[PDB]
Amino acid sequence: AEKPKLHYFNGRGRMESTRWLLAAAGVEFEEKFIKSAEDLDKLRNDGYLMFQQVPMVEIDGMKLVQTRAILNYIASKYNLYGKDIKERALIDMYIEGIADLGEMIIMLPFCPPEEKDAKLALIKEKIKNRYFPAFEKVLKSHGQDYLVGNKLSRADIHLVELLYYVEELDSSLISSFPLLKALKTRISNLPTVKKFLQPGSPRKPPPDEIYVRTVYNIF
Amino acid sequence: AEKPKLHYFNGRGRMESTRWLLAAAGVEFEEKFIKSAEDLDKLRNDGYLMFQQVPMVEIDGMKLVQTRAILNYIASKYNLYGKDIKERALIDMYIEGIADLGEMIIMLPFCPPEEKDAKLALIKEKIKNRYFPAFEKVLKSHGQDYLVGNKLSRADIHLVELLYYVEELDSSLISSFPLLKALKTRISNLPTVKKFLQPGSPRKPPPDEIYVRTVYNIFRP
Numbered sequence: 270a271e272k273p274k275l276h277y278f279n280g281r282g283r284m285e286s287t288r289w290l291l292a293a294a295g296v297e298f299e300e301k302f303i304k305s306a307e308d309l310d311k312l313r314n315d316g317y318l319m320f321q322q323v324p325m326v327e328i329d330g331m332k333l334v335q336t337r338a339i340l341n342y343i344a345s346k347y348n349l350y351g352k353d354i355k356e357r358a359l360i361d362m363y364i365e366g367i368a369d370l371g372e373m374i375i376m377l378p379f380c381p382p383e384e385k386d387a388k389l390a391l392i393k394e395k396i397k398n399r400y401f402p403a404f405e406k407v408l409k410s411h412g413q414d415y416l417v418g419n420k421l422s423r424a425d426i427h428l429v430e431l432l433y434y435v436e437e438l439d440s441s442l443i444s445s446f447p448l449l450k451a452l453k454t455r456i457s458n459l460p461t462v463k464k465f466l467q468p469g470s471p472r473k474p475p476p477d478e479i480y481v482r483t484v485y486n487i488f
Numbered sequence: 489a490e491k492p493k494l495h496y497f498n499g500r501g502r503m504e505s506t507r508w509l510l511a512a513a514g515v516e517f518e519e520k521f522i523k524s525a526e527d528l529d530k531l532r533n534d535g536y537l538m539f540q541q542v543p544m545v546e547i548d549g550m551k552l553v554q555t556r557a558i559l560n561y562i563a564s565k566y567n568l569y570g571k572d573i574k575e576r577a578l579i580d581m582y583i584e585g586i587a588d589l590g591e592m593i594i595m596l597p598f599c600p601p602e603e604k605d606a607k608l609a610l611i612k613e614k615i616k617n618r619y620f621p622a623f624e625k626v627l628k629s630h631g632q633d634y635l636v637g638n639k640l641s642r643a644d645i646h647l648v649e650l651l652y653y654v655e656e657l658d659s660s661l662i663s664s665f666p667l668l669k670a671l672k673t674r675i676s677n678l679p680t681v682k683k684f685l686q687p688g689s690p691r692k693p694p695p696d697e698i699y700v701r702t703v704y705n706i707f708r709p
């Protein structure tokens with residue numbers, strides 16, 4: 270078999286978590302960037318997209334769509350999904366909270382400018398009161414260097430990803446949560462993640478104005 | 489050792505597909521309904537809602553929140569998650585597309601009326617042009633009775649659940665999809681699912697105005 274092939278726009282969006290997880294697992298992938306509406310419609314009409322939507326990853330003979338199908342498979346494959354049914358329950362419970370928060374961040378740049386002050390402030394509120402307290406509590410309780418099973422899981426990789434986006438948004442939000450600060454540091458220093466955080470990697474930048482309207486020219 | 493306890497409002501929403509799956513799996517459950525803002529608070533203050541939200545299921549000594557956490561567990565436990573990593577991948581693909589549609593049907597009754605007509609037209613368009621052809625194509629591709637690995641999985645239950653809501657919405661949308669209709673009939677006749685489709689089961693009605701205001705009252709009275 271070949272290297273996993275990521276089909277998306279050249280930008281973060283719904284593919285970035287998969288990029289983080291593959292790189293976290295030491296897997297070399299390639300990207301075929303959708304540059305235009307035509308690029309997408311070609312994928313659609315060639316029957317590559319089960320639901321007419323990207324992200325799409327060609328991996329192990331399959332054309333997998335839907336971000337969570339993609340991510341589960343990778344996590345399962347590279348032993349990043351715990352060791353039994355209960356660890357998975359915990360892992361799922363966590364990564365789904367992270368995906369609800371991350372969903373608001375991914376959408377933020379698209380809602381109209383008059384609603385931005387309000388939608389951001391509600392994210393900061395939920396970060397401060399809901400999600401970060403949630404995850405600090407987990408770390409405080411068992412005292413261990415990883416969210417689940419006392420070893421690296423996709424939850425870890427998904428949270429740390431989200432802590433870089435929360436840093437980009439407001440660097441003080443994490444200030445009251447020392448366990449999340451240390452988590453970020455340890456995970457960022459894992460040889461595979463460290464290489465992914467360095468310049469030149471497939472890691473994608475935040476959305477700028479160009480990114481938004483380029484996105485509108487493809488959706 | 490006790491029955492799983494499902495903690496949610498008395499209605500469909502985000503608990504319904506867990507009710508389907510549990511029943512499909514032959515597992516009897518109890519429900520504790522959230523009637524008030526106080527009922528929600530008691531759960532939160534007990535420290536039982538990890539993200540201050542329901543659905544929550546009490547099951548095998550855990551308190552599971554997050555729909556996808558709940559469904560996954562029940563699917564693995566009761567062998568409804570395929571047999572290997574590859575089957576899981578297709579099942580997940582199929583059901584996450586069902587989930588994306590399901591989500592829209594779940595939010596529609598809380599849309600403002602300014603946006604309702606367009607949102608409903610979109611849901612149907614998406615059923616006609618995106619989803620029903622997606623699954624029709626998968627069932628034609630291998631001619632088998634089940635979506636994945638020629639045996640009953642969660643993907644068959646979640647889809648056929650969806651087929652019942654789409655029927656309510658507009659009963660004509662399935663008519664040009666012979667294989668879906670056939671799948672709906674077979675799965676409906678499996679003994680566990682037949683018991684659940686029968687009158688007087690925990691299967692819940694479509695959301696009415698009383699449900700719609702009960703829910704608004706619980707987050708903002």
Ligand SMILES: N[C@@H](CCC(=O)N[C@@H](CS)C(=O)NCC(=O)O)C(=O)O
Pocket residue numbers: 369501502540541542543553554555556
């Ligand atoms: N993604 C979550 C959605 C859960 C959710 O939003 N639940 C609502 C009612 S359906 C809730 O309890 N909201 C409380 C809040 O947001 O404060 C899941 O799958 O469980």
